Design a binder for these strands. Structure first.
Lengths: 57, 233, 68, 199, 118
RNA sequence: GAGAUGGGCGAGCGCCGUUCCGAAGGGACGGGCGAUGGCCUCCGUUGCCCUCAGCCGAUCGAAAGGGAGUCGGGUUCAGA
RNA sequence: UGAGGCGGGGGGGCGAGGGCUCUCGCUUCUGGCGCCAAGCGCCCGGCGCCGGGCGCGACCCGCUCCGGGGACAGU
């Protein structure tokens, strides 16, 4: 619909019931969740591995 | 005893690690033009070689000698115009039925009574805007043997009189009581200004490089003295 | 009076004390606008010679003119 | 007695550049603490074609270090840059294609582009399509560096000024012959009114 | 007290309101567009009467400065009647003509007889 | 594209310039205090203090560009 | 450049010979996220309860916002 008409429409006509719904496509959301999770898990194994470095020296 | 939910979330303000906190930036503000001009002229008075005639106003009277000087002059304050009214209405009631010693304000009144040697002490303010109004005055008081001192601030000197500012204030006569208080301050004053006159005339001011630049040459010379420290032994 | 000293002092525009003040002022005046009001005369003596009297109604503007 | 064509170009008003559809000024990121003491990570958001310029541009998005914001830039794409690639900028930045870092940190014979001619002017040299400059030699004291320019001239620049590593994308453009007078018309219609040149 | 931002902004200063020691003009100017100056005269043209019986409206030559709001409250006050809507146009000769449609509870045909046009 | 202010220039009418040499925001949220109005309930209004701000170039520039929302039938000598 | 961390001086960590000689004060694998303080310490107000302040966190001191030129450009 043309932009200035979106005033009239109710909320549900303009979005999708999901995080980032109505702003991002689903497949790019689940790739964003996987990414945000694997990155944090990768920081963990780095932080606990360098904790070993300060015991070795 | 403690709630285990309370956890400390530290922040790592490393480069590109976390957003920087609002720390003070008073050293990098883009100040208005009237402030920049206001400040970098006080810097010019340190870079340029100030001639002795202007630099002699930085060698100022110290703190406590100033106060006791003001406690003395506070009893020779000229009559405010309320008492100027109160003085002549007491002159009225006697006709229908001499002047005490006062202070003397203004260069135009002071220089005359210095040129006539009626002054016993003259105070000058160091921060006169067109400094040309007072430049000659120390050299004159010395030439005619008048004790002169320099007080910081024409404002506090302009508070003795009930004006905003005042450049100079002279002592012509004092009452019999505080003649020793004046006498002791005189010898406490001419011992620094009057008799040290020729010492002042050869004293140029300013000529100080910035703290950021002196550290640069002192690094090159301390590194110059460091290798010569090991050059012979 | 002091005005005679200030007058005769401004007749020494080559002396070290005058050469300093002039270059300091001329620096500061160069940082302002080409036409702006001055609070008081920078030359009190010259002002009185020309008709200035310190009283409400007398205004002093310091303005800048390109030489040549 | 009449003013010749070469003289009328200085007044403009017909010989001004056609800058309606130009995407922006292609510059480097301004110098700040991060670029001066460490590095800062940026993402290549998209690679776009700027009218009137052979070399393509690259929208690179950074994360502003002082405010919650995302600053975007327009670099001059170094050949080999692709979208979704991380670009690093600063003194500690590693030496890979599409990483702007100060010249003094690079070894000799490093092929750079979008080089700054004065420290902190956001790149001025070697930024046409396919051009590059080489870091010839350093000089630790006096903080100076010799680089040769795409004209062959060697120049002594300060060690502080920086440049993005790699040649400028879009090289070899001048090899294809303009075949038609029409192709030349469209080339200059996107740059400025200068083309049909009466001798 | 610290400067969090590197910019210096002119601080907000107190600004008072006008307290004039005398009114600039003696007395307020009287309204020269009252109800009698708005409505000049009605029309008695063959189309004007045709507009009265059919559409139950009145046709007036109003002043060129008046709004539909001023015209509405004028006829409402000069003739003690209620108005549905007012349509106005500016004639080619210059004056402004206003078609005033009366509310259905008022019959414009008799209202025209009170004011004299018929 | 035009064009003020700051600024600059100019004998001068004025001109240049449009973010550039500028203290360029008269707004907002919340809090605190005082005060009022209507069942001074509760809310609105106001002053003061505190807290926050990226705004970024006044203004003009299209009856073919952008721009929410009206259609059917009837009616006049001439308007839909 | 939204003039945002400049110059010194202290603090800690990484090394060879208890301080001196120097690096460092924390981000490189991914088209993710990042603001408007957690924490600690100290004062203060109202009926254990509710609500504020200050300081560390975020070192200290400074005279040019940083650079680059420079008594030459320039006028």
């Amino acid at each position: 619909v043309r932009p200035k008409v979106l005033m009239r429409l109710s909320k549900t006509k303009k979005h999708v019931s999901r995080a980032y719904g109505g702003s991002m496509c689903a497949k790019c959301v689940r790739d964003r969740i996987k990414r945000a999770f694997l990155i944090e898990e990768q920081k963990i194994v780095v932080k606990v591995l360098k904790a070993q470095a300060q015991s070795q020296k | 005893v403690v709630n285990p939910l309370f956890e400390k979330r530290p922040k790592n303000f490393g480069i590109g690690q976390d957003i920087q906190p609002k720390r003070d930036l008073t050293r990098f503000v883009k100040w208005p033009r009237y402030i920049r001009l206001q400040r970098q002229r006080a810097i010019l008075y340190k870079r340029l070689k100030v001639p002795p005639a202007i630099n002699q106003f930085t060698q100022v009277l110290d703190r406590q000698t100033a106060t006791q000087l003001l406690k003395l002059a506070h009893k020779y304050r000229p009559e405010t115009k309320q008492e100027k009214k109160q003085r002549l209405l007491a002159r009225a009631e006697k006709k229908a039925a001499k002047r005490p010693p006062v202070l003397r304000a203004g260069v135009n009144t002071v220089t005359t009574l210095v040129e006539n040697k009626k002054a016993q002490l003259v105070v000058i303010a160091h921060d006169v805007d067109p400094i040309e109004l007072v430049v000659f005055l120390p050299a004159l008081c010395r030439k005619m043997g008048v004790p002169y001192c320099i007080l910081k601030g024409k404002a506090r000197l302009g508070r003795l009189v009930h004006r905003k500012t005042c450049t100079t204030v002279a002592f012509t006569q004092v009452n019999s009581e505080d003649k020793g208080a004046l006498a002791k301050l005189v010898e406490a004053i001419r011992t620094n200004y009057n008799d040290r006159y020729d010492e002042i005339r050869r004293h140029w001011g300013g000529n100080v490089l910035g703290p950021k630049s002196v550290a640069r040459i002192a690094k090159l010379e301390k590194a110059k003295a460091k290798e010569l420290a090991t050059k012979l032994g | 009076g002091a005005y005679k000293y200030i007058q005769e002092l401004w007749r020494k525009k080559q002396s070290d004390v005058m050469r300093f003040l002039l270059r300091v002022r001329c620096w500061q005046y160069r940082q302002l606008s080409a036409l702006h009001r001055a609070p008081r005369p920078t030359r009190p003596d010259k002002a009185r010679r020309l008709g200035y009297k310190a009283k409400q109604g007398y205004v002093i503007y310091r303005i800048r003119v390109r030489r040549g | 007695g009449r003013v010749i064509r070469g003289q009328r170009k200085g007044a403009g008003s017909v010989f001004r550049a056609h800058v309606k559809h130009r995407k922006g000024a292609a510059r480097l990121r301004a110098v700040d603490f991060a670029e001066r003491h460490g590095y800062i990570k940026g993402i290549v958001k998209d690679i776009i074609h700027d009218p009137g310029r052979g070399a393509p541009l690259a929208k690179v998005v950074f994360r502003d270090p002082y405010r919650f914001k995302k600053r975007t830039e327009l670099f001059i794409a170094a050949e080999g840059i692709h979208t979704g690639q991380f670009v690093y900028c600063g003194k500690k930045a590693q030496l890979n294609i599409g990483n702007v870092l100060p010249v003094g940190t690079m070894p000799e014979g490093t092929i750079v582009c979008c080089l700054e001619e004065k420290p902190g002017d956001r790149g001025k040299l070697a930024r046409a399509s396919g051009n590059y400059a080489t870091v010839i030699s350093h000089n630790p004291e006096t903080k100076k560096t010799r680089v040769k320019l795409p004209s062959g001239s060697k120049k002594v620049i300060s060690s502080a000024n920086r440049a993005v590593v790699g040649v400028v994308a879009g090289g070899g453009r001048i090899d294809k012959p303009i075949l038609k007078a029409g192709r030349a018309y469209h080339k200059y219609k996107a740059k400025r009114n200068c083309w049909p040149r009466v001798r | 007290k610290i400067r969090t931002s590197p910019t210096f902004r002119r601080p907000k200063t107190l600004r008072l309101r006008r307290q004039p020691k005398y009114p600039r003009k003696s007395a307020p100017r009287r309204n020269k567009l009252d109800h009698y100056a708005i409505i000049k005269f009605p029309l008695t043209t063959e189309s004007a009467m045709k507009k009265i019986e059919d559409n139950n409206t009145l046709v007036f030559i109003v002043d060129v400065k008046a709004n539909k709001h001023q015209i509405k409250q004028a006829v409402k006050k000069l003739y003690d009647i209620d108005v549905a809507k007012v349509n106005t146009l500016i004639r080619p000769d210059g004056e402004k003509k206003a078609y005033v449609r009366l509310a259905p509870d008022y019959d414009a045909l008799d209202v025209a007889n009170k004011i004299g046009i018929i």
